[PDB]
Amino acid sequence: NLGSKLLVGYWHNFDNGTGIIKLKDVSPKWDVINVSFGETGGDRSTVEFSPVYGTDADFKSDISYLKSKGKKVVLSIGGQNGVVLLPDNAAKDRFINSIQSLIDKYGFDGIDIDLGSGIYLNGNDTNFKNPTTPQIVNLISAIRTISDHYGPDFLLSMAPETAYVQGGYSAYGSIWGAYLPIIYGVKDKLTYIHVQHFNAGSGIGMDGNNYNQGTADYEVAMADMLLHGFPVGGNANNIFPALRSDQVMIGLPAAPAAAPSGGYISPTEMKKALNYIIKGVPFGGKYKLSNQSGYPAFRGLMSWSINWDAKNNFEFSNNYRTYFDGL
């Protein structure tokens, strides 16, 4: 079903100046389309979604079309202007029910967790294998419940910011490391994770060195932490285990403007990072990969976004599709 080298692209269910792309006009180079976004109202727990164009039937039909072409269409929950709060079981149930309703209604292939607020590790929540914070416990539970409610081809992805994942190397509390229990809690159902390697400033690798976003070294350092695992919160006895290589992707801006706070990397530089991550071929960078000979099963690239890509001469899709096809 799903290929071993993927391009996952976010699709704007809204017009932010880059315009609307009808689903059938989405470049075939994208293997997975993350429809953005499912959003909540007053109760911050019931997720709603209405297509930006066409009737509900029309939209479902376009999705069915994409699916017939081998593409996956995923519902992304978030993001910048999305918020899900599950303080208790009642909220969790509204969340589960609303999501399942949407999946059925439109025929989504799965869900993408793209929540960048309302997620914190409470005081005393110190063990990523056994979280205690309601938001986190309930999210894990809801995700597992939803996943179990659908067949083997259900797709589960997530796009946390680096502080929530790799940031766990520095601290475990508040937002720092906060997605680690989520990842660990659903690892057996996780298709892949694509951390947002952008609007991130700098990041500390497993070598204790600081790297700047938008550089080949940074891309390798951040991905390697998921490919290899790493000690959490300065505790050598608290190691976050490696994910399967096929569960690891990297999230990138399709264009400089797609990440106004920085993060964009030129395909030329990114290919150096990819060749190092995948084939173990160095490029003279400062960061030394955990595995000398690479992680060939590395899953691919995610991008914000399909709409930005189309506005930027299809630079992202053309460059990386050709790269991965060439493997």
Ligand X SMILES: CC(=O)N[C@@H]1[C@@H](O)[C@H](O[C@@H]2O[C@H](CO)[C@@H](O[C@@H]3O[C@H](CO)[C@@H](O[C@@H]4O[C@H](CO)[C@@H](O)[C@H](O)[C@H]4NC(C)=O)[C@H](O)[C@H]3NC(C)=O)[C@H](O)[C@H]2NC(C)=O)[C@@H](CO)O[C@H]1O
CA 143 to chain centre: 15
Question: CA torsion sign, 116 to 120 to 126 to 127?
Answer: negative
Nearest distance, CB of residue 184 and ligand X, angstroms: 20
> How many angstroms separate the Cα of 252 from the Cα of each of 34, 81, 118, 294, 307?
14, 19, 23, 21, 13
Q: Where are the beta strands (DSSP E) in the chain?
A: 6-12, 32-40, 47-48, 72-78, 110-114, 155-158, 192-196, 202-204, 210-212, 229-232, 235-241, 248-253, 300-304
Q: Does 261 bind ligand X (CB under 6 A)?
A: yes
Q: Does 196 bind ligand X (CB under 6 A)?
A: yes
Contact 239, 233 (CB under 8 A): no
Nearest distance, CB of residue 246 and ligand X, angstroms: 21
Q: Which of 260, 266, 281, 286 binds ligand X (CB under 6 A)?
A: 260
Q: Does 80 bind ligand X (CB under 6 A)?
A: yes
Q: Which of 64, 81, 89, 210 binds ligand X (CB under 6 A)?
A: 81
Q: Which of 84, 259, 270, 277 binds ligand X (CB under 6 A)?
A: 259
Interacting residues with ligand X between 34 and 63 (CB under 6 A): 37
Residue 198 CB neighbours (<10 A): 24
Q: How many residues bind ligand X (CB under 6 A)?
A: 21
Binding mask 153-182 for ligand X (x = CB under 6 A): ------x-x-x-----------x-------
> Maximum distance among all alpha carbons in the chain?
54
Q: Which of 154, 264, 304, 324 binds ligand X (CB under 6 A)?
A: 304
Q: Does 79 bind ligand X (CB under 6 A)?
A: yes
Interacting residues with ligand X between 98 and 157 (CB under 6 A): 114, 116-117
User: In which element (H, E) is residue 135 found?
Assistant: helix 134-148
Residues that bind ligand X (CB under 6 A): 10, 16, 37, 79-81, 114, 116-117, 159, 161, 163, 175, 196, 199, 251, 258-261, 304
